[PDB]
């Protein structure tokens, strides 16, 4: 038997109720099977050929979404605004009249019936910023023992010992900036921090599946730029509002901004229409604010700190600053030890040299390759620099070494070892493989330099005292 | 015979099903022929004037598409935003409850029914650029063996031996750069790798051409630049999301950027526009960030190695920087062999001396022509490069040679042969025709160089130590 549905409107003493069906309200009687007292406002009811209510179910589960604006004085009516900014007055459903009805919340509404059936939390911030937790830990970072201590303190200590902090009335810092040459470990540190925070939150609370990582908000540089005029500012305000709401005294909220060069550009000085004069003040006002934001730390990573606006870098707003530099000989040794694990297969000859001592052979290889990389020889002369007066200064590859190129060297050495295995059949990795990898990497990377003056060039010019005026490669 | 249609909504234990039909929701009984157990939410069903469900069908295939906004906690519903910023909560049908319906996906939906089914974006237009797979393979490229070996090791080798890479804990390279003088054969390799990938996908997964072509993306250069602020970055994000979705740790996705200098710069070289200042950080975050592309390889080709941003030209992003050098005598011989095929018609005059042995005659002709063009005679003198030091250097036409020039010479010789056979009636390519074509080409490309050219003279100037101040054409 085909029977239509409708939505209840009100209950009367005459055992007759108003039902909205077919786009109109009709006064219909209820069948003796159903109880008029059991009915609830906004509950969906069943109809039939005689338009008699026979069976009553639950409230509506689908429809439009409209943000709640204001509850009226009587409490049975609520004024809301639609998607196209239409103001409408609706009657709340029985469950709406634990969960708290507050202004600004979203409600599931139907325009034809004019009722709000449930409150649906939008939680738009949970979208576009959540990501799968990386597995990088603090033990996987080498050559950085001072910077990691700084960031680990600034992230954990205010939350490790809260009583001692309150004893000295020391507020946790709310601005952490990481800057340095490309491929030196900034994103690595950010990933390690995110992993540690996710593990800590999973330890403290449940819901390990989801929300455990919700406390780390990863935002790419231009990801917040939008085509419309005011959408980006509203997105900034909404993200900061959610960060304020989600934050607690014991649970930090880390909003990480990657590629700080794009946003936070110096106001003005833009030849194209990349108008930062609207977005940047919004970020400044959100971070500093008329009221101090609490339990929030913002982390920014960039390799061009010169183009960043002076106001965002002002102390107190981004006070904690960390510089990551080019690895030295000891840092290079540490990084190689991080990558050249003992579990990596080694050739029989190398093991026989040290009578099968894995650690001794590995450390000998690391020391030899590090000494070869940083040795000042004629073949390692990378660039020649002429200053205004200066002298013929020679920059070697040790002045441009980084963790990324060390990883690339190890990767191509492993590739050469695999090629040797496929062509010869002897598994293992040789020191000569490492040396060939080093020379090939330098030969491939000796085409980098261009007539530009980044921060390293500025540092060199300041050290010498004369501006850089000529740079040439030593091909022959 | 007259029968209606409707959309299934939910099922009950009373052998009843909710059906949306004619703009109203009803509950109906299924015919004994159809079993309600196999029914799924959102399936299209057939009705009748007696209002009885008689047969199930496939889901709806057309309608409005609405970007997905968020996934609700229950999992049976999701919030989606319409074209004009209207937001609705809609059920998720059986096919969506394969790849997770991640937020940011325009889902095919019916607003009146309130159900979702599918999605897609504009980045597929890149796949439309490669509608025809080039037929050129590695066998058609000559003079480059080390470069082809490297490009095969970067792409084909990691997927040819997964177990060996897993044992050595080595991941496939994240990016490959190809750089060299114009016409040296970068696009040839760029299209040969695409042809090989198409062949592999056709032979391994399925014979369908569209899926095989779907694993290669052709950027074409400045195609990403758009009119509105923040839309090009969204396009890049969509492209990389599409790339990450197709990856399965055994199927590579190759995104080829042509003319890398068009959209990538040093963030300060932009004079008229600085769109790259926002574009570059987005791509840097996409390539390496908190979440990194596991199995995506980015291949870039450019003619200006130094003009690219240093961050892109970093190990871990562009691991191998293959350099393609101008052909030498052996490379010229290889290219001529690849072009002067044995099957070309040859005049009986040429075959008279070599008893009609086509292969030997063609090889001798190729050697003679390459010897003619690679001759240090006063007739081949082209330019006089001077320096501040005063070490004047005489350059020949052989220095400014490439595969494109060889192809042009062969085409000109063929045109001369066709003109000769049209006028006289004796077919066959002659040796003197090649020499005439060579001298005519060297005459036609004579008055090319401008006052100052940083194309390939910067390397020579750096080699000599001094800068070029005057160059003159030494003809007659």
């Amino acid at each position: 038997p085909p029977s239509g549905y409708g939505v209840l409107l009100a209950t009367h003493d005459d055992d007759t109720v108003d039902v909205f069906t077919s786009g109109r309200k009709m006064r219909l009687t209820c069948s003796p099977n159903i109880d008029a007292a059991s009915l609830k406002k906004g509950q969906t009811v069943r109809l039939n050929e005689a338009l008699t209510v026979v069976e009553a179910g639950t409230f509506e589960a689908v429809g439009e979404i409209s943000t709640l604006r204001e509850i009226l004085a009587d409490g049975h009516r609520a004024l809301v605004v639609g998607h196209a900014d239409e103001e409408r007055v609706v009657w709340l459903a029985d469950p709406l009249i634990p969960r708290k009805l507050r202004p600004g919340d979203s409600l599931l509404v139907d325009t034809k019936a004019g009722y709000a059936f449930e409150r649906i939390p939008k939680a738009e911030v949970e979208d576009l910023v959540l990501e799968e937790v990386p597995d990088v830990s603090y033990a996987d970072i080498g050559g950085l023992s001072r910077q990691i201590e700084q960031i680990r303190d600034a992230v954990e200590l205010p939350f490790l010992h809260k009583e001692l902090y309150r004893e000295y009335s020391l507020r946790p810092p709310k601005g952490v900036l990481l800057y340095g040459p490309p491929g030196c470990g900034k994103t690595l540190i950010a990933k390690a921090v995110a992993n540690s925070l996710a593990k800590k939150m999973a330890e403290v609370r449940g819901d390990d599946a989801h929300e455990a990582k919700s406390y780390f908000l990863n935002i790419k540089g231009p990801e917040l730029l939008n085509k419309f005029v005011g959408e980006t500012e509203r997105h900034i305000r909404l993200i900061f509002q959610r960060a304020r709401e989600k934050a607690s005294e014991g649970t930090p909220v880390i909003v990480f901004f990657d590629e700080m060069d794009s946003i936070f550009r110096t106001r003005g000085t833009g030849v194209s229409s990349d108008v930062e004069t609207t977005v940047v003040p919004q970020l400044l006002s959100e971070i500093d604010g008329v009221e101090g934001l609490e339990n929030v730390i913002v982390i920014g990573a960039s390799n061009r700190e010169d183009m960043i606006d002076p106001a965002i870098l002002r102390p107190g707003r981004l006070d904690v600053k960390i510089k990551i530099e080019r690895p030295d000989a000891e840092a290079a040794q540490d990084i190689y030890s991080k990558y050249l694990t003992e579990f990596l297969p080694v050739h029989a000859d190398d093991l026989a040299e040290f009578d099968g001592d894995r650690s001794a052979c590995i450390k000998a290889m690391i020391e030899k390759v590090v000494d070869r990389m940083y040795a000042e020889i004629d073949d390692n002369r990378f660039l020649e620099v002429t200053y205004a007066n200066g002298d013929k200064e020679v920059m070697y590859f040790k002045d441009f070494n980084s963790g990324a190129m060390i990883q690339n060297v190890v990767d191509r050495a492993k590739k050469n070892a695999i090629k040797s295995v496929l062509e010869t059949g002897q598994p293992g990795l040789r020191i000569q493989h490492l040396l060939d990898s080093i020379v090939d990497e330098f030969a491939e990377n000796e085409d980098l330099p261009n007539t530009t003056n980044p921060d390293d060039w500025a540092r060199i010019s300041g050290k010498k005292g004369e501006r850089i005026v000529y740079i040439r490669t030593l091909v022959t | 015979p007259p029968s209606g249609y409707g959309v299934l909504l939910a099922t009950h234990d009373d052998d009843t099903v909710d059906v949306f039909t004619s703009g109203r929701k009803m509950r109906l009984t299924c015919s004994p022929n159809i079993d309600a157990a196999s029914l799924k939410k959102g399936q299209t069903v057939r009705l009748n004037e007696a209002l009885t469900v008689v047969e199930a069908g496939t889901f709806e295939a057309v309608g409005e598409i609405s970007t997905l906004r968020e996934i609700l906690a229950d999992g049976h519903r999701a919030l989606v935003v319409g074209h004009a910023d209207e937001e609705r909560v809609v059920w998720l049908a059986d096919p969506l409850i394969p790849r997770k319906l991640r937020p940011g996906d325009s889902l095919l939906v019916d607003t009146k029914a309130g159900y979702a089914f599918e999605r897609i974006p504009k980045a597929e237009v890149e796949d439309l650029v490669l509608e025809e797979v080039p037929d050129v393979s590695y066998a058609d490229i000559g003079g480059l063996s080390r470069q082809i070996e490297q490009i095969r090791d970067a792409v084909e080798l990691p997927f040819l031996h997964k177990e060996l890479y897993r044992e050595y804990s080595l991941r496939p390279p994240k990016g490959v750069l190809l750089y060299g003088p114009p016409g040296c054969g970068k696009t040839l390799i760029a299209k040969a790798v695409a042809n090989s990938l198409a062949k592999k996908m056709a032979e391994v997964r399925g014979d369908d051409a569209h899926e095989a072509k779907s694993y290669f993306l052709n950027i074409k250069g400045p195609e990403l630049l758009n009119k509105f602020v923040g839309e090009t970055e969204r396009h890049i994000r969509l492209i990389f999301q599409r790339a990450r979705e197709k990856a399965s740790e055994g199927t590579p996705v190759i995104v080829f950027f042509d003319e890398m200098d068009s959209i990538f710069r040093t963030r300060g070289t932009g004079v008229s526009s600085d769109v790259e200042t926002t574009v570059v950080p987005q791509l840097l975050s996409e390539i390496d960030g908190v979440e990194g592309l596991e199995n995506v390889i980015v291949i870039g080709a450019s003619n200006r190695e130094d003009m690219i941003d240093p961050a892109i030209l970093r190990p871990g992003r562009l691991d191998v920087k293959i350099k393609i050098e101008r052909p030498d005598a052996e490379a010229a011989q290889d290219i001529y062999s690849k072009y002067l095929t044995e099957f070309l018609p040859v005049h009986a005059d040429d075959l008279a001396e070599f008893d009609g042995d086509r292969s030997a005659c063609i090889k001798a002709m190729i050697e003679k022509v390459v010897d003619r063009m690679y001759a240090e005679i006063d007739d081949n003198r082209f330019l006089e490069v001077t320096y501040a030091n005063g070490d004047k250097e005489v350059m020949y036409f052989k220095d400014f040679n490439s595969g494109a020039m060889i192809q042009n010479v062969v085409d000109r010789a063929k045109k001369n042969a066709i003109k000769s056979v049209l006028e006289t009636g004796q077919p066959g390519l002659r040796i003197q025709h090649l020499l005439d074509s060579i001298v005519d080409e060297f005459a036609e490309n004579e008055d090319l160089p401008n006052t100052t050219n940083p194309d390939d003279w910067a390397r020579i100037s750096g080699k000599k130590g001094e800068r070029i101040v005057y160059i003159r054409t030494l003809v007659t």
Binding site: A84, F228, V229, V271, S272, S273 | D85, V229, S273, V275
Partner: peptide, 17 residues
């Protein structure tokens, strides 16, 4: 006075039916 390109920002429009 170098010539420079531009990038515009759309404003939403209200349309019914």
């Amino acid at each position: 006075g170098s010539m420079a390109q531009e990038q515009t920002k759309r404003g939403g429009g209200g349309g019914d039916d």
